[PDB]
Amino acid sequence: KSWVEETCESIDTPECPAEFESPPTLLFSLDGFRAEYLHTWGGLLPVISKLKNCGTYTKNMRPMYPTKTFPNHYSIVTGLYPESHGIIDNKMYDPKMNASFSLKSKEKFNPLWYKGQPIWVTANHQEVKSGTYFWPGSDVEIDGILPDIYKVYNGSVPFEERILAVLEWLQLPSHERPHFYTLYLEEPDSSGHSHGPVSSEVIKALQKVDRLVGMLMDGLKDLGLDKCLNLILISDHGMEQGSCKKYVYLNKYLGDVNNVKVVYGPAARLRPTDVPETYYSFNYEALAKNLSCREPNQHFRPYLKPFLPKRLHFAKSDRIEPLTFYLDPQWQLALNPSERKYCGSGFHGSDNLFSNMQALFIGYGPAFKHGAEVDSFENIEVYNLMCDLLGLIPAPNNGSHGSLNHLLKKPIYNPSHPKEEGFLSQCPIKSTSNDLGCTCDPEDDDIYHMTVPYGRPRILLKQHRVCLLQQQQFLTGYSLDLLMPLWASYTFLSNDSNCLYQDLRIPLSPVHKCSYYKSNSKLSYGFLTPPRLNHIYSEALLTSNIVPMYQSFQVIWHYLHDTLLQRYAHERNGINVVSGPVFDFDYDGRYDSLEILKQNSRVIRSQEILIPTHFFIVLTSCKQLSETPLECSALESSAYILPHRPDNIESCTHGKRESSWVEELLTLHRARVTDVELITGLSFYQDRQESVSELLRLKTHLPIFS
Ligand SMILES: *[C@@H]1O[C@H](CO)[C@@H](O[C@@H]2O[C@H](CO)[C@@H](O[C@@H]3O[C@H](CO[C@H]4O[C@H](CO)[C@@H](O)[C@H](O[C@H]5O[C@H](CO)[C@@H](O)[C@H](O)[C@@H]5O)[C@@H]4O)[C@@H](O)[C@H](O[C@H]4O[C@H](CO)[C@@H](O)[C@H](O)[C@@H]4O)[C@@H]3O)[C@H](O)[C@H]2NC(C)=O)[C@H](O)[C@H]1NC(C)=O
Ligand SMILES: Cc1cn([C@H]2C[C@H](O)[C@@H](COP(=O)(O)O)O2)c(=O)[nH]c1=O
Ligand SMILES: *[C@@H]1O[C@H](CO)[C@@H](O)[C@H](O)[C@H]1NC(C)=O
Ligand SMILES: *[C@@H]1O[C@H](CO)[C@@H](O)[C@H](O)[C@H]1NC(C)=O
């Protein structure tokens, strides 16, 4: 009986043959295996289905951006964001090197492109042999290291021969046998492009790939290793149906110009032709502004590199072009109809939160649980997973180590919460009492737990000076070094102008006076906690609850609290809110140091002001709608990192449909709670009853579009 014909068997303890001390780990990749494939065509894939039912499976695995083979395949083995490991796209360009990059190029084998530290290199430093077969980055030597058994990519090699090559390696002597293995197949990406996600060729391709995995499992069984191997069946991205009617050509707005170069696709980038002479000299801002809101329902959007949604993490690299494009699902962009390969073919590269861009993940073996279906996770989390499977100390990556502990039978690493680095001080009444120049028209322990019911945010900033200012409706962490609130937390239950009051607990700043704000300047102040809470709540009008905010952004901030927040309180039976300013001027996704903070402080209206680049807001509710936010058994988080812009050009307000475009901006800039943590230097939910590993799972979560 073949392996697919046998039923499920619990592998609680690894049954390994002699000469084996611990089960090896094989990384099997199927390029272009969209997550929807297994959802729909499970009955046509008997081998893959058995791996799902007897292993750890996830409906959707979120890949990196853009959704291309090389960036993702390399992000898997490095656990790094594409913006940090260097491989941004299949085709790209580095100004500092004056060189282009391509799969079919001599530059592909150039080690100056590959950053970070792939798993086989990590394994090499800790004395673990690795035998790879066609994995991106395996051909090139990184940090002067090559896998003990490697193969320069040759797509002509038959699939059946690739499996046998690895099966032959498993028989090598105990001292010369690799402990980590890789396998790569071009299907169903190839059939997906040429015929589309819904075709007879993809069904035939899925079945072809399915029998091939079955060949491996029968081969493993004949070697007596079917219960002695950790298998990770993964893919790089999904597949979307492209259309000729749904394609954008830049020439229609610019003309047949030759001063600009466009990298076509759903994730388009633009660079000037005179490069690197005008790579920075070219002002993209004018071109970006000249391309926004030209159509009634434009299916693409011009983005300066830092203005992209933070969840994408696609800015802090030289190779990423300063002008990018965000496109609607099923839409691609190009300069001229001649540059593109084809318009009505299966494509990928769209937003990584899109439904059809989702990837595959199946963990099978003695180390993985049997028939356990888990929630979605990013592929950068997989790097740490392999280190635990190979017994390696992981290189510094972007994945939250331990967040995938629920996949393993016996977890290797037990994570802990980050210690508080902030210099926590207290603010008594010390400075009374300045004139604010405002016109106004006519115990403690119980109130604390009510405002921060999951525990106060811990200050990970080193070594920032923060005071905890307690009020009757909210608790705010105030910064003494910046003289403005870092965060303000309050609980809003299901059913419950030009004036301000000086908070005598904080030192007075000239920007706290209403006299500082004129009706002509676009810059004003906003509240972190809505004053319309619970008559009218006056403590929300404290000086310590205001932040510098553009007038154009106040349109989004007020509607967010006056309309949406109240609707969410009815749907989710109350919500707990934590809000605050975000300062990331170097657009790297992490909080800025005091040094770079002082460099970006503009002076306006004769006073020095540090103005926020973004505003974060975290909404927390109960998973059970019968419970209020003060008595949750399980949490329901949703974070947002909203861009603080002087105008609303991104939204195309023109047509004036306000209730629509605001929510579309909110949904687009949704982010992981971890993303908010990374960019603000705060740590949430530390006093929460669930374990650290569970909380990591919660904070790294993002919802899938459509
Ligand atoms: C995802 O995860 C990745 C990896 O974990 C994160 O990426 C990391 O980001 C940090 C900071 O953003 C990087 O550290 C910085 O490295 C740069 C560049 O280093 C080189 O650049 C210079 C060449 O011109 C040179 O100055 C450096 O030389 C030495 O510098 C110091 C001097 O003492 C020395 O200690 C180093 O060993 C170097 O030999 C070097 O050649 C550097 O500019 C940064 O310095 C800043 O911080 C330091 C203090 O650490 C400070 O002294 C400086 O003033 C400056 O402010 C810093 O070292 C790191 O390299 C990245 N890791 C990798 C491998 O990519 C990423 O942040 C995560 N992303 C998200 C969104 O979470
Ligand atoms: C793994 C690998 C794939 N390729 C090719 C084969 C795939 O068909 C192609 C991926 O297409 P894609 O990026 O659009 O998904 O890249 C290389 O050129 N070199 C390599 O090392
Ligand atoms: C950059 O490279 C191109 C071709 O590789 C070359 O024509 C050009 O002269 C180079 N420019 C500089 C400044 O080296
Ligand atoms: C690629 O692989 C095939 C099959 O092994 C082989 O016949 C061919 O010669 C190889 N091509 C290259 C580039 O060596």
Ligand SMILES: [Ca+2]
């Ligand atoms: Ca920063």
Ligand SMILES: [Zn+2]
């Ligand atoms: Zn691919």
Ligand SMILES: [Zn+2]
């Ligand atoms: Zn492809």
